[PDB]
């Protein structure tokens with residue numbers, strides 16, 4: 001079977017690896033420039049910038065490379081001025097050979113519990129328009145659609161201001 | 162003529178007021194269901210779910226004429242980000258530099274926390290803002306292109322929870 005649990009500092013290597021795997025699955029692996037050190041400093045200090053749940057499997061089923069972590073979800077809390085606290089699901093991925101065993105479902109169950117405990121009114125998340133399989137996975141679980149134009153201002157300009 | 166400072170719990174009354182006005186400006190004042198109590202708790206409890214900067218000058222008797230609501234987010238590919246959720250300056254007070262000064266403070270916040278970028282939202286139905294930002298280096302992050310924002314409301318969450 002498997003166990004869903006909060007991430008720990010020692011899971012960052014596995015988390016980074018799964019992040020690159022999902023990005024690759026999204027045809028943009030080259031974009032991942034975050035490192036293990038970043039994940040540790042940003043997720044395991046006094047004030048985390050994100051939170052992760054990971055799926056650990058028994059030794060008999062570790063990956064060929066010898067990895068015990070085969071899935072994860074990264075999230076953090078956001079705020080809507082009209083409704084209040086929201087749980088934001090940032091990244092969600094399960095290794096190919098481990099999909100279809102109920103890991104992603106259990107992860108969503110834990111996420112929902114985190115949401116209710118922190119009294120979030122809803123959970124929001126993005127999905128590549130072409131990623132139909134996942135889309136239907138989410139939809140079958142209450143997922144619904146929700147537009148504007150996302151802009152950004154890099155540190156290059158922020159520093160200026 | 163004005164000062165930009167962090168908000169305190171006693172400014173929540175003004176915050177809601179400005180939230181309502183911005184929502185009214187977006188033609189959706191009815192949509193705001195958040196209460197002043199909620200804001201103080203969510204914003205000044207043991208865990209702040211957001212941060213707020215307010216503009217204060219020396220109408221209905223209020224000295225707070227503008228604000229910006231933000232919080233930190235994380236991008237798995239680039240790291241820490243500053244997320245600007247709400248930004249507003251009462252009409253009579255626009256055009257003097259308040260908004261620009263607020264962005265200035267937000268920028269300092271982003272540099273202090275070492276955020277690699279500040280994300281927010283701009284409406285296409287308004288060229289002014291688009292350029293009001295573009296002139297500030299605000300690159301059009303069409304990165305959103307190819308993504309479908311989704312939501313799972315409390316109902317479906319409680320279902321998965323229990």
Ligand SMILES: CC(C)(COP(=O)(O)OP(=O)(O)OC[C@H]1O[C@@H](n2cnc3c(N)ncnc32)[C@H](O)[C@@H]1OP(=O)(O)O)[C@@H](O)C(=O)NCCC(=O)NCCS
Pocket residue numbers: 022025090091092093094095098099100101102103104105106126127128131134136137138140
């Ligand atoms: C989407 C994803 C995270 C879901 O995780 P998962 O581990 O495969 O999920 P589950 O195994 O719990 O559910 C997958 C399916 O197997 C079926 N399943 C699992 N265990 C089962 C069992 N014992 N008996 C019958 N069916 C079973 C489920 O019913 C489900 O399909 P459904 O949508 O009709 O309910 C995973 O497929 C993946 O990593 N894909 C890419 C991730 C992605 O696109 N990113 C999200 C955007 S951030």
Ligand SMILES: CC(C)(COP(=O)(O)OP(=O)(O)OC[C@H]1O[C@@H](n2cnc3c(N)ncnc32)[C@H](O)[C@@H]1OP(=O)(O)O)[C@@H](O)C(=O)NCCC(=O)NCCS
Pocket residue numbers: 183186245246247248249250251254255256257258259260261262282283290292293296
């Ligand atoms: C967008 C908003 C917050 C900007 O704040 P603001 O106070 O009006 O902005 P500014 O103070 O920079 O005034 C704008 C203009 O006044 C002029 N200005 C500023 N300071 C000045 C000064 N000291 N002397 C002369 N002109 C001045 C500028 O030309 C400037 O625009 P530019 O820099 O692009 O050329 C405000 O217009 C508003 O509340 N709009 C609706 C909110 C909205 O669209 N946001 C929703 C997204 S969450």
